[PDB]
């Protein structure tokens, strides 16, 4: 495989970014990561045969690499106690930054694309396709935090984000009233996402998430949020979505797999169509 890595200067973050590349055409699938996203390679490549199984689709694949606990998000400072010497601002970097470079080197196009995210980033594959709606018509959430800004969410993703490198929400995206929250949340941003017809897949995995509370309790917590989305999305006038809930499906790489293979066909004819 052509897999390529390559070294992208970000500018709002002060420091080159390393991105895995397939080619194969000009529509790219962006690959996001999870929570515990690591610096040498993207959680995909780790863990799953996606670059082969994406290999002469007609589509481009970019797996990003690094930005744990980020949320692919511009945060309002660095996270201050884990010695963060520089601001995240990976929703700069993936809507302005990459493109640019990607279209400038190599003739991706900056618009058109999928993007592709699970667990921390399942709500950011929707976020940026809410926003940025001619780069990403296509946006799918495996296992994602669908209503980030309510209830229990902000206080567990918080926790979760202390769990992964230390990260303090407070520095992304404010204390839990600040308008970033609901800016960032894909309940909220359902309206959206209707109005610019994106076309969204979303999965559902059951049993163990991926905080010292009961599973039980946090399963219970997932499903509500889960089928209070599905049942907005409806109720908003969203007509473009598929809602993926199997029982036996997981929150973890096997399935999430699974899903970025049932989806291949799905966004080859959205893009490709």
Known sequence: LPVEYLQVPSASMGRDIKVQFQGGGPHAVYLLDGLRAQDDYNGWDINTPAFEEYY?????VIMPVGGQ???????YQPSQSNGQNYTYKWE????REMPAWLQANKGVSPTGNAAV???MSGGSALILAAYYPQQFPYAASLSGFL???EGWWPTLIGLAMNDSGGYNANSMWGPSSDPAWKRNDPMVQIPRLVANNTRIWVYCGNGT???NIPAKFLEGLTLRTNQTFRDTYAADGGRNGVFNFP???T??????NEQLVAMKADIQHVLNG
């Open 247 to 249: 029982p036996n499906g």
């Open 56 to 60: 002469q689709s007609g589509l481009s």
């Open 251 to 256: 929150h973890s790489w096997p399935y999430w």
């Open 147 to 149: 209503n980030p800004s």
């Open 92 to 95: 700069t970097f993936l809507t």
């Open 117 to 119: 995210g699970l667990s």
């Open 209 to 211: 998430p991926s905080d």
């Open 69 to 75: 606990s980020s949320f692919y998000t511009d945060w």
